[PDB]
Amino acid sequence: AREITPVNIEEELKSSYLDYAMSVIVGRALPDVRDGLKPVHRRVL
DNA sequence: AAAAAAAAAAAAAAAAAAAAAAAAAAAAAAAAAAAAAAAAAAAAAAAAAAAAAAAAAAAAAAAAAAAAAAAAAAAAAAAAAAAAAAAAAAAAAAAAAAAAAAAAAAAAAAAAAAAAAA
């Protein structure tokens, strides 16, 4: 509950980039093996 | 033959622009009244000129408002600190003349083709 807190460049970069990488890999890039559709195709259909 | 950089595939992030149609305003560029300014004519109040004159500076001298001296007291202006306005100095720049490289027209002449004669 403080206006400013320290954050390391390493921790912030690692958390943000890992979140983005996992989100992309699981949610837009690769298709599921079962139905063979990405989430965009699944939602559109 | 090694290094480096472009480009393309597909789901994601985020932007930009041209016109039509009417009615009003705001810039911005013109003709066109309208008055300063200037050239060139005749024309007419002012200086000149002269004689003649009388109104205000000199001069005597008193006296009455005065400018320096004395004192008390009020407080305007000057110089030192800071804080804004407004103008030359210097440097930079976008079109703009100069130069150099690529596209289109040109015919001279021949390869290949098409066509026909005897």
Swiss-Prot record:
Reported impact of residue 28 to A/Q: Nearly abolishes DNA supercoiling. Reduces quinolone-induced DNA cleavage and relaxation
Superkingdom assignment: Bacteria
Protein localization: Cytoplasm
Family: Belongs to the type II topoisomerase GyrA/ParC subunit family.
Subunit structure comment from the entry: Heterotetramer, composed of two GyrA and two GyrB chains. In the heterotetramer, GyrA contains the active site tyrosine that forms a transient covalent intermediate with the DNA, while GyrB binds cofactors and catalyzes ATP hydrolysis. Can form a 2:2 complex with toxin CcdB in which GyrA is inactive; rejuvenation of GyrA(2)CcdB(2) is effected by CcdA.
Domain characteristics, as noted in the entry: An N-terminal fragment (residues 1-523) can be reconstituted with GyrB, but the complex no longer has negative supercoiling or ATP-independent DNA relaxation activities, although it is capable of DNA cleavage; ATP-dependent relaxation is inhibited by novobiocin and non-hydrolyzable ATP analogs. The fragment has ATP-dependent DNA relaxation and 30-fold improved decatenation activities, unlike holoenzyme it preferentially binds supercoiled DNA.
Function: A type II topoisomerase that negatively supercoils closed circular double-stranded (ds) DNA in an ATP-dependent manner to maintain chromosomes in an underwound state. This makes better substrates for topoisomerase IV (ParC and ParE) which is the main enzyme that unlinks newly replicated chromosomes in E.coli. Gyrase catalyzes the interconversion of other topological isomers of dsDNA rings, including catenanes. Relaxes negatively supercoiled DNA in an ATP-independent manner. Negative supercoiling favors strand separation, and DNA replication, transcription, recombination and repair, all of which involve strand separation. Type II topoisomerases break and join 2 DNA strands simultaneously in an ATP-dependent manner.
Name used for this protein in its record: DNA gyrase subunit A
UniProt lineage: Bacteria, Pseudomonadati, Pseudomonadota, Gammaproteobacteria, Enterobacterales
Residues included from the entire protein: 5 to 49 of 875
